[PDB]
Amino acid sequence: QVQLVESGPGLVAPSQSLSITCTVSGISLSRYNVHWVRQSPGKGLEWLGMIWGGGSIEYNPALKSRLSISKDNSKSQIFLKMNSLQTDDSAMYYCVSYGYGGDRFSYWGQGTLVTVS
Amino acid sequence: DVVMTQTPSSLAMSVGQKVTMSCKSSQSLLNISNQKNYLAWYQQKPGQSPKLLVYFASTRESGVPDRFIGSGSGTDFTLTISSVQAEDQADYFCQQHYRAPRTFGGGTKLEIK
Ligand SMILES: O=[N+]([O-])c1ccc(O)cc1
């Protein structure tokens, strides 16, 4: 019933800008915190940022310069934008939520693959 | 910069045996305030997103079997699988949720023979 679906660009040329959308259903974003995580075989799992139920936003300090997170409660979508893309940024990008009252405490999305090349 | 460390990086167990895998952090994860340990455990099978198994170091996520038990506090935590089953062959990660950036462990690749 609850689903986190992320959309992305697929392949994208370096020093271009990334832009991903996390489409949520089944829950209210006012009651759940949404994180952005990416995974790759070489790099492992990395925490990018998050946006709390009450709108507060946090970033991976090491990446803040190029990142930008936001949300739209009415459309139940969360956004991530990354600048200065390098081949180094290819990975599976995921949005993950945590909160109380659902069947589960958290829901990990399906992931959207980003192939920078 | 809280540094998360999982051991062992990989191990081979047999069905029915008890499995123990560690996860340690460079700073305590115990929130002196609500006394909760901000540490999660995930299971990831091939071509799948990881799934939450345990949060707050010991609370099982809904749907997770009882054979999975998280333990510890402060800086040294453990995930035990009382009697491992064939379908438990996966990668296990721990993530710290105490401070940003919420760092992940390196992973433990559990091979079930
Ligand atoms: O300790 N934990 O595993 C946690 C704590 C808070 C949260 O929103 C997610 C996970």
The answer to whether the CB of B7 falls within 8 A of the CB of B22 is yes
Ligand 1 pocket, mutate which of B39, B55, B77, B104 (most atoms under 8 A from CB): B55
Tell me the domain boundaries of chain B: 1-113
- Render A21-34 in DSSP notation, one character per residue: EEEEESS-TTSEEE
Question: Would an 8 Å CB–CB cutoff place B104 in contact with chain A?
Answer: yes
Nearest to A76 by CA among A53, A106, A100, A50: A53
Nearest to B50 by CA among A6, A3, A109: A109
What is the distance between the alpha carbons of residues A89 and A115, in angstroms, rounded to a whole number? 8
Q: Is the CB of B41 under 6 A from ligand 1?
A: no
Pairwise CB contact (< 8 Å): A111 & B100: no
Q: Entry resolution in angstroms?
A: 2.3
What is the distance between the alpha carbons of residues B71 and B65, in angstroms, rounded to a whole number? 15
The domain defined by B1-113 carries CATH number 3.40.50.10680 = no
CA B90 vs. chain centroid, Å, equals 12
CA distances from B45 to A28, B27, B90 (A): 28, 29, 5
Interface test with A, best of B52, B96, B108, B109 (most A CBs within 10 A): B52
CA B74 vs. chain centroid, Å, equals 14
Q: Is the CB of B93 under 6 A from ligand 1?
A: no
Q: Kindly list the residues from chain A whose CB atom is less than 8 angstroms away from the CB atom of residue B106.
A: 44
Identity of the amino acid at B46? P
CA distances from A28 to A25, B28, B57 (A): 8, 32, 26
Strands A112-116 vs A3-7: parallel, antiparallel or unpaired: unpaired
- The DSSP 8-state label assigned to residue A17 in this structure reads -
Separation in Å, CA of A15 to nearest CA in chain B: 24
Nearest to A99 by CA among A32, A25, A1: A32
Separation in Å, CA of B54 to nearest CA in chain A: 10
Pairwise CB contact (< 8 Å): B107 & A46: no
Pairwise CB contact (< 8 Å): B52 & A50: no
Burial code (b: 16+ CB inside 10 Å, e: under 16) for B30-46 equals beeeeebbbbbbbbbee
Report how many helices (DSSP H) and strands (DSSP E) chain B contains, helices first.
0, 12
All domains in chain A, ordered by first residue: 1-117 (2.60.40.10)
Question: For tokens 């009450």, what's the residue?
Answer: A54
Q: Is the CB of A98 under 6 A from ligand 1?
A: yes
The answer to whether the CB of B25 falls within 8 A of the CB of B75 is yes
Separation in Å, CA of A54 to nearest CA in chain B: 17
